[PDB]
Amino acid sequence: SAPLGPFNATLLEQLKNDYQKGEKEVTRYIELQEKVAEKYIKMTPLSVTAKKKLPPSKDPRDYMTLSPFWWPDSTKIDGLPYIRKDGERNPEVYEYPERENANRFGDAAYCLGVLYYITGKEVYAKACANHLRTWFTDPKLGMNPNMTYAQAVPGMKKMRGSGFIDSRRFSRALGVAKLIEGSKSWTPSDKKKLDDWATAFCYWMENSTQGQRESHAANNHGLWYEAIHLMVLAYLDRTDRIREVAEQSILPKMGAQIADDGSLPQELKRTLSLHFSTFALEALMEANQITSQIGINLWSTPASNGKVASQAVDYLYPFYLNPEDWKFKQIKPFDQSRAAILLYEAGTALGNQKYVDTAKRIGLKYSTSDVETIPYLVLK
Amino acid sequence: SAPLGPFNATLLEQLKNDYQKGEKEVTRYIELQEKVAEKYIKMTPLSVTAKKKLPPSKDPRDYMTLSPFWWPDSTKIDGLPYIRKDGERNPEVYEYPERENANRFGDAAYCLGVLYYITGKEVYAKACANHLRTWFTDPKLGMNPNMTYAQAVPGMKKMRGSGFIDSRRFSRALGVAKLIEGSKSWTPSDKKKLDDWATAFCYWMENSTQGQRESHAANNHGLWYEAIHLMVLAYLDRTDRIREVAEQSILPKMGAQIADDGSLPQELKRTLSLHFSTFALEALMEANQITSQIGINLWSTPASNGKVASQAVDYLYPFYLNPEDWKFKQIKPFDQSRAAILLYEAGTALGNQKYVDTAKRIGLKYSTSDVETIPYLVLK
Numbered sequence: 001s002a003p004l005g006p007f008n009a010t011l012l013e014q015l016k017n018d019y020q021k022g023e024k025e026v027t028r029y030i031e032l033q034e035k036v037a038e039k040y041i042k043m044t045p046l047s048v049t050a051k052k053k054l055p056p057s058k059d060p061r062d063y064m065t066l067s068p069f070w071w072p073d074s075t076k077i078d079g080l081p082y083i084r085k086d087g088e089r090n091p092e093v094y095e096y097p098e099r100e101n102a103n104r105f106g107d108a109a110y111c112l113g114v115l116y117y118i119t120g121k122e123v124y125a126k127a128c129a130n131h132l133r134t135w136f137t138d139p140k141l142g143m144n145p146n147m148t149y150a151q152a153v154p155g156m157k158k159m160r161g162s163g164f165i166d167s168r169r170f171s172r173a174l175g176v177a178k179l180i181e182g183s184k185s186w187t188p189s190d191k192k193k194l195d196d197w198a199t200a201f202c203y204w205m206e207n208s209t210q211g212q213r214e215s216h217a218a219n220n221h222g223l224w225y226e227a228i229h230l231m232v233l234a235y236l237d238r239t240d241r242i243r244e245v246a247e248q249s250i251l252p253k254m255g256a257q258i259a260d261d262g263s264l265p266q267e268l269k270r271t272l273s274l275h276f277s278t279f280a281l282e283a284l285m286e287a288n289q290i291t292s293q294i295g296i297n298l299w300s301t302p303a304s305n306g307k308v309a310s311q312a313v314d315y316l317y318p319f320y321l322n323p324e325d326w327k328f329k330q331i332k333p334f335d336q337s338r339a340a341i342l343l344y345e346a347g348t349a350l351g352n353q354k355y356v357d358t359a360k361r362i363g364l365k366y367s368t369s370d371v372e373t374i375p376y377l378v379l380k
Numbered sequence: 381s382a383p384l385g386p387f388n389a390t391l392l393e394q395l396k397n398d399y400q401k402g403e404k405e406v407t408r409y410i411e412l413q414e415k416v417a418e419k420y421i422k423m424t425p426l427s428v429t430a431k432k433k434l435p436p437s438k439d440p441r442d443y444m445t446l447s448p449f450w451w452p453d454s455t456k457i458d459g460l461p462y463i464r465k466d467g468e469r470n471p472e473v474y475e476y477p478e479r480e481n482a483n484r485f486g487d488a489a490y491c492l493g494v495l496y497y498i499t500g501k502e503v504y505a506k507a508c509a510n511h512l513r514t515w516f517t518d519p520k521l522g523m524n525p526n527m528t529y530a531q532a533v534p535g536m537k538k539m540r541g542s543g544f545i546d547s548r549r550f551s552r553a554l555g556v557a558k559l560i561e562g563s564k565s566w567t568p569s570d571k572k573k574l575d576d577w578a579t580a581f582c583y584w585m586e587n588s589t590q591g592q593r594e595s596h597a598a599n600n601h602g603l604w605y606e607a608i609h610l611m612v613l614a615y616l617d618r619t620d621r622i623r624e625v626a627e628q629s630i631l632p633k634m635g636a637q638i639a640d641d642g643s644l645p646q647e648l649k650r651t652l653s654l655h656f657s658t659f660a661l662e663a664l665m666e667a668n669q670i671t672s673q674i675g676i677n678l679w680s681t682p683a684s685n686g687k688v689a690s691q692a693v694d695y696l697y698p699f700y701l702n703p704e705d706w707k708f709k710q711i712k713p714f715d716q717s718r719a720a721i722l723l724y725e726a727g728t729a730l731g732n733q734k735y736v737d738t739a740k741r742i743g744l745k746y747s748t749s750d751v752e753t754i755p756y757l758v759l760k
C-alpha cells in the first residue's frame with residue numbers, strides 16, 4: 001500500500017507489484033522509464049535563487065514570477081501600469097527563471113521519486129534527495145516558504161493572491177518526497193528540515209492574507225488552492241484536515257461553480273474557456289487522488305446544494321471527442337491529450353465505462369517522457 | 381528631400397517640414413515622440429555576443445536563434461530530432477538572447493534615427509551611433525556579417541535558409557544609419573566600417589547557398605528576402621540594383637504567388653493563414669517604401685503575367701474589416717491593427733480612398749510607443 005501522496009495510488013502499487021513479480025510488460029515499461037529518468041540523475045539541482053532581478057524583499061530565496069496575461073501599456077511612457085490581455089501569454093514571463101525552473105525541478109523529483117518507489121534502486125532516492133534539499137531546505141539555496149511575490153504585476157497597487165496557483169509545480173514534488181522515506185539517502189535530519197519547511201508553507205497558505213484570499217476564489221483558483229493544500233497536508237500526514245478540507249471546502253466550492261447544465265460559468269467567460277474548464281477539473285482530479293486514498297471520492301460525492309462533479313465531466317465529454325465543436329472563446333488550440341488522464345481518473349472513480357474507453361482510445365504515447373504520465377501504462 | 385531608406389519618405393518629409401515651420405500639431409506630436417525616445421538615450425547598447433550557449437562555429441559574434449515552430453520530440457530519449465508544429469511558438473526561442481535583443485536594438489536605432497532626421501538634435505545621432513557601432517562594426521561586440529545560424533533546428537541534418545527572415549529586425553536599423561550621416565557623431569570612419577559591413581552582408585546574402593536558396597523561396601520568405609535586400613542595397617546607394625531586383629525578382633515572385641482571385645495560396649495552407657497573407661503583403665509594403673523613392677510602385681506595377689499586388693489587398697480587405705469572416709485555418713486571433721499601416725501604405729500608393737479611410741477608422745493610438753508607427757501621425 002503506497003505512502004499517502006499525489007498520484008493515482010492504485011496504478012502505482014499495481015506497477016510496483018507487477019515489477020517485483022517480474023511481469024514482462026511492466027518490467028519493459030519501467031526499463032523505458034529508467035532510460036527516460038537518466039537525465040535527472042546528471043541534471044544539476046536547481047534553486048529559486050538563480051535570478052538577477054530580485055523581489056521587493058531584496059531576497060533571492062523569495063519566489064517571484066510575472067502574472068502571465070499582463071503586458072506593458074504602450075500608451076504610457078514607462079509601460080506602467082501593465083494592462084491585462086486574457087489568454088495571451090506575455091513572453092516576459094520567461095525572464096523570471098523560477099517559472100520554468102520549478103517545472104524542471106517538479107518533473108525531476110517526481111519522476112525520480114516514483115522510480116524509487118517502483119524499483120527500490122537507491123540511485124533514484126539519492127538523486128531525488130539532491131533535488132529536494134536544494135530547492136526546499138538548503139540554508140542558502142532553498143526557497144523561503146511563502147508565495148508573496150508569485151505572479152506579481154508591475155504597476156499594480158494592491159496585493160494579489162492569484163499567483164499561489166504556481167505552487168502546484170513544486171507541491172507535487174513535496175508529496176513524492178514521502179516515497180523516498182526509509183531510503184539511505186533521505187536521513188532523519190533531511191526529513192525534519194522538510195517537515196519544518198512544509199509546516200511553515202502550510203502556515204503561510206492558511207494565515208497569510210494572500211492565502212486566505214486565494215482559498216476564497218470562486219473559480220479554478222480556489223480548486224487548485226485546495227489541491228495544493230491537500231498535497232501539503234498529505235505530506236504532513238494530517239489526514240483529519242484532509243477530510244475536513246474535502247468536506248467543508250472542496251465540495252462546497254465545487255458545487256458553487258457547477259451550473260445546472262454542468263457547465264463552469266466562471267471558466268466559460270474566459271478567452272481560453274475550454275482550456276480553463278479542463279483546468280478546473282484537473283484540480284479536482286489531483287485533489288481526488290489524495291482524498292480517495294482515505295475513502296473520499298470527489299467525483300461522486302454531491303455537494304450540499306445537490307451538485308456533483310460528474311455533472312461537469314458530462315457537460316465537457318462531447319467536446320473532448322470533438323474539440324472543434326466547442327462554442328465558446330478558445331483563442332489557442334486545445335490539447336485533446338489532456339482528456340486522456342482526465343476521463344480515466346473520473347471514469348474509474350464513477351464506474352463509467354464510456355469514459356475509460358474514450359480515455360484509452362485517445363491514449364498517451366507509449367514512449368513519451370512527460371513525467372505526469374508515468375503511472376499510466378494502462379493508457380499507453 | 382529624405383535620404384534613401386526604409387520608411388515612408390513622403391510622411392517623413394511632411395513631418396520634418398511641419399516641425400520646422402513650427403506647426404503646433406506636429407510640434408506637439410514630435411515632443412511626445414521625444415519623451416518616448418528618452419529611454420533609448422540611456423539604454424546600454426546590445427550585442428549579439430551576450431550569450432552563453434555558443435553556435436557550432438564557437439563564435440559569439442554569429443547570430444543564432446531557434447526556428448520558432450520546432451519542438452522537442454517527447455517520444456525520443458533526447459527530444460531529437462525536433463518536429464514541426466505549424467503556428468505554435470516554442471518558448472525555447474527566448475533562450476536565444478538575440479531573438480529579442482535584435483528587436484530592442486532595431487527599435488532604438490530606428491527611433492533615434494528618425495528623431496534625428498526630424499529635429500536635427502545631435503543627442504539623437506550620438507545615441508543612435510552608439511547602438512549602431514556596438515551591434516554592427518565593433519571588433520569584439522559586433523555581429524559577423526552572415527545569418528548562417530539563424531533559426532537553427534536541433535537534430536536537423538540539412539542546412540536551411542529560412543532564418544534569413546530574422547534579418548529584417550536589424551536591417552531597418554542599418555538603413556536608418558543613412559539619416560545620421562552628416563552629424564558630428566557619425567564620423568567618416570564609422571561610416572566606412574558600416575559600409576564595409578553592409579557590403580560583406582550583401583555578399584553573403586547573394587552568394588552563400590543559404591542566401592541563394594532563400595532568394596528563390598516560393599512563399600512570404602522570398603518576398604521578405606527581397607525587402608531585406610532592398611534595405612541593404614538602399615543603404616549602399618545601389619539604386620540600379622534596386623531597379624533590377626524589383627523587375628527580375630520581386631515582380632515575378634508576385635506574379636507566381638498571387639492567384640487569379642487574389643489569394644496567396646502558399647499562405648493559405650498555414651495554420652495562421654490570415655497572419656501570413658498579411659506578412660507577405662507587409663514584405664511588399666516595406667519593399668515598396670524603398671522602390672517608390674526611385675519611381676517604382678510595387679502596388680500597381682504588373683508582373684509579366686498581368687497580376688498586380690493590389691489584387692492581393694482586394695482579396696483580404698473584407699477580412700480586415702471583419703476578421704471573423706476569415707474562412708481558412710487561423711489558430712490564433714488576428715491583430716486587426718496591422719491593417720492600419722498596411723491599408724494606408726497600399727491605399728495612398730493606389731489612390732484607393734476606401735483603403736485610406738479604413739486605415740484611419742482603425743487607427744493607431746496617438747501616444748503609442750511602437751516605434752514603427754512614428755511616421756504615421758496621419759493615422760493618429
Ligand SMILES: O=C(O)[C@H]1O[C@@H](O[C@H]2[C@H](O)[C@H](O)[C@H](O[C@H]3[C@H](O)[C@H](O)[C@H](O[C@H]4[C@H](O)[C@H](O)[C@H](O)O[C@@H]4C(=O)O)O[C@@H]3C(=O)O)O[C@@H]2C(=O)O)[C@@H](O)[C@@H](O)[C@@H]1O
Nearest residue numbers: 067068069070084086089151162163165219220221276279
Ligand atoms: O502560464 C501560466 O503561468 C499558467 O497560467 C494559468 O492560468 C492562470 C494564470 O496563471 C492567472 O493566474 C490567471 O489569473 C486570472 C484570474 O483567474 C481571473 O480570471 C482574473 O480576472 C479578474 C481580473 O483580474 C480583473 O480584475 C477583472 O475586472 O475581473 C476579473 C474576474 O474576476 O473575472 O484575472 C486573473 C489574471 O489574469 O491575473 O488565471 C489563470 C487561471 O488559472 O484561471 C494556466 O493557464 C496554466 O495552465 C499555465 O501554466
Ligand SMILES: O=C(O)[C@H]1O[C@@H](O[C@H]2[C@H](O)[C@H](O)[C@H](O[C@H]3[C@H](O)[C@H](O)[C@H](O[C@H]4[C@H](O)[C@H](O)[C@H](O)O[C@@H]4C(=O)O)O[C@@H]3C(=O)O)O[C@@H]2C(=O)O)[C@@H](O)[C@@H](O)[C@@H]1O
Nearest residue numbers: 447448449450464469531542543545599600601655656659
Ligand atoms: O516568430 C518569428 O521569428 C517570426 O515568425 C514569422 O514566421 C516565419 C517563421 O519565422 C519561420 O521562418 C517559418 O518557417 C517555415 C517556412 O516558411 C515554411 O513554411 C516551411 O515549410 C515546410 C516545413 O519546413 C515542413 O518540412 C513541411 O512539411 O513542409 C513545409 C512546406 O510545405 O513548405 O516551414 C518553415 C519552418 O517552420 O521551419 O516561416 C514563417 C514565415 O512564413 O515567415 C512571422 O510569424 C513573424 O511575424 C514572427 O516575428
